[PDB]
């Protein structure tokens, strides 16, 4: 890597280790990682979510819990970590609980599993919201692989998952999550 | 791992119970990590459509259970992960609970957990009735008038099902029509027909053989011309 | 509860044709729909999930579609092994509900019923009862109507009708009708008539007995 | 209300670097990190120093005292405009091998998920190598 600029001066490099940065701290900091083009991951506390985007409406407004205010998420889960991570994520992406359309989560009394779903579709009357969300995802995920095409249906679902031990550690994502998370 | 297998069974006694008694169905599995999958109990009544009864989940979700409204308080779904088994205890049984019961497994589909069933048990017939076991009465059906001649065997007033009807110990197979049994006054009724050539009858003896195992009844009725 | 409506109870086809079974939900269920196959009331077989995704191991003859309330299962190039019952299911809300079902039967040329009327046995008359039987064997299609004329008067009290499923060899149907009267009411009259109405002939086929 | 984690010769532990070997930087270079919020290297040093402190003395309460928010926003905007930006991972510096004096490390920028070729930012390490000499002769005269 190094080379000589003159005969007395030298070009040199230094690289930081993210393994040491995220291993030698006792603070539970949120991890945001991009495994591939279709699967994103976010860990916080004892909660860990796989985030995916596709046209499947896993939840429907008629049968599942409508979330309009963070407190409403009390019915989504029995683990406070999952509720807190979901609220923090929706805050970081830029969801306005006052003027933006409500989103959906599965009632905790049902046994399919925890999950929440945001429309995100870049079409029709949603196109503004879908843009903002996209922008948020570009801030939270470096090199964010946008999978939601224009004029198409593209619902996002976040569900529990075991953290991929092979996912790259990117601290820029954590920094953006901590900074944007303020409200 | 090996073949995915789900086998149901009745823990105590048989599938025939009286109204008001209890009954515990079991369902043992192999070929998959039982502790990672959610298990369902369903039932199919005769003539009516398949009904969902209960679901139980894994240890991560505290073995939570969900029931349909009609069985809430009477039925209880449980699981033993060490024995890879799921159980359905049914109390205060009624005549409307008569059906074929199934255990089933639900997995993940297109990357999302849903309650589509990818594996089922073989089925356990459960009959709830206050009728008493009684062998049948067998009556021959011969025509009053004189190429092909059709005769019959009527099996009336038996409980429970089934009954085995044959013609000349199975010698007459082509042209035999045995119809589904019908339930009336808590007793079953059945009819069987056989079509034999004019040379076979009444020249040679045509006999229907009816077997009712529950009452240990073996009747051979020869059809005599009118 | 969500009602999954399959309006076609039976559907006939021939080997090689293309068949389409429909299902209509009483509520909007999106794509949370599965399609199952079942034979002889045995263990069902998962065919389709998420309305359009085929399960592993299912032949590519089976496709499916729909979103909202109208869902359709399609079998292209039907085989003999594909003759079974088919039903839909929604899993968008509790309780999970299934369709009434649709039985896929084999298309066949028309056949007229063989009608045969049987007076009550002597042993049955000894026991105080009297059952007059009427067999209607080997007909196609299954749509038949059966009436009973005691001395001309049409009787519907005491009729017990038993239908058999499509036979595996000749692909025909059969039916039995039974009049269960008491010995006294049986001896009250003299003539008994079993009348059948099938689309093979507009004239109803009649088989009667006296005394 | 300064609100900037003061670092205060700064050596980097083995677990901090991919080189897996301690690396010390001179006092004169790390002195520039004090109250400078336009150097990604100084933000990384503050992060690692805060972490090493905390495991001796819940996450992200003092984050704006460790990193520059405007520099992070700049780098994000540069990523989104498809121009080179900083990954806060690899850094380069000029070192006078004889005396051991070096410059404050700067970010090795990336474009299309690849570190820029050296030539593609030569003007930066030429200029740096100039300034270094200028501040060495200024130290020799003092
Ligand atoms: C900021 O941006 C830079 C540049 O984009 C990132 O640096 C790269 O990081 C990736 C991972 O995100 C590294 O990729 C891995 O590299 C290994 C080979 O590295 C050696 O060889 C390359 C040249 O080929 C040298 O540049 C490098 O120094 C090493 O000498 C491979 O082993 C890896 O592939 C395997 O990875 C996993 C391991 O479990 C396997 O499962 C896979 O199947 C696969 O085989 C992998 O590709 C890449 O080397 C880095 N480039 C560098 C350092 O120049 C920074 O990480 C990024 N900072 C962040 C994200 O925080
Ligand atoms: C996420 O938001 C998106 C975008 O807002 C949303 O998808 C859209 O849903 C609307 C319904 O709310 C669809 O509107 C239809 O659009 C066309 C015109 O483009 C019309 O044909 C339709 O009206 C006719 O058809 C209906 C069919 O039943 C009839 O009932 C009606 O009377 C008319 O004849 C209708 O307005 C729109 O097409 C979609 N867009 C896309 C790209 O899918 C989506 O539902 C939201 N997802 C959620 C909430 O999960
Ligand atoms: C992005 O990554 C996900 C996660 O999978 C994990 O990471 C991958 C990079 C691989 O290393 C995986 O081994 C690892 O678990 C991938 O999702 C997985 O995709 C595969 C292949 O499509 C799916 O397998 C199929 O699944 C179905 C249902 O079980 C069967 O019909 C098939 O037989 C087949 O096994 C697998 O289910 C899926 N896993 C999860 C958890 O989603 C994803 O494919 C990948 N995307 C890209 C573009 O690389
Ligand atoms: C979340 O669900 C609970 C429980 O709902 C019941 O169980 C579900 C699995 C499903 O089958 C529902 O239809 C059932 O009602 C809801 O609380 C219940 O609300 C009903 C009336 O809606 C009431 O009769 C029960 O007593 C309630 N049970 C409890 C334990 O409080 C709850 O309202 C749902 N939350 C939201 C936000 O919709
Ligand atoms: C700049 O270069 C010098 C000279 O190579 C490095 O200092 C040497 O470090 C080695 C150990 O790695 C010692 O054995 C030498 O005695 C040192 N030489 C000196 C101090 O003149 C120095 O580490 C380099 N600086 C940086 C920041 O990498």
Author numbering:
A (entry chain A): 60 to 242
B (entry chain D): -1 to 144, 149 to 228
C (entry chain C): 1 to 211
D (entry chain B): 252 to 259, 269 to 317, 328 to 412
Question: What text comes from the article?
Answer:
Additional modifications of the JUNV constructs included replacement of the SKI-1 cleavage site with a furin cleavage site for improved processing efficiency, and the introduction of a proline substitution to prevent helices from forming or extending as utilized for LASV GP1−GP2e and the severe acute respiratory syndrome coronavirus 2 (SARS-CoV-2) spike. The introduced inter-chain disulfide bridges likely restrict the size of the HR1c (α7) helices, thereby preventing them from merging with the HR1a (α6) helices and transitioning toward the post-fusion state. This renders the E321P (JUNV) and E332P (MACV) mutations, the equivalents of the E329P substitution in LASV, unnecessary, as their intended role was to block the merging of the α6 and α7 helices to stabilize the pre-fusion states. To experimentally establish whether the proline mutations had any marked effect or not, we prepared a JUNV construct lacking the E321P substitution (JUNV GP188-329GP2e*). Reversion to Glu321 revealed that the mutation did not markedly affect expression levels. Furthermore, crystal structure determination did not reveal a noticeable effect upon the configuration of the protein or its mode of JUN1 recognition. In both constructs, whether residue 321 is a proline or a glutamic acid, it is unresolved in the electron density, presumably reflecting the flexibility of the local structure.
NW arenaviruses present a glycoprotein (GP) complex on the envelope surface of the virion, which orchestrates host cell entry and is a key target of the immune response arising from infection and immunization. Each protomer of the GP trimer consists of three non-covalently linked subcomponents: a stable signal peptide (SSP), a membrane-distal GP1 attachment glycoprotein, and a membrane-anchored GP2 glycoprotein, which are the result of proteolytic processing of a single SSP−GP1−GP2 chain in the endoplasmic reticulum. Following host cell attachment and internalization, GP1 is expected to detach from the spike in acidic endosomes, enabling GP2 to enact its role as a class I fusion protein. Here, we address this paucity of information through X-ray crystallographic determination of JUNV and MACV GP1−GP2 heterodimers in complex with the Fab fragments of neutralizing antibodies.
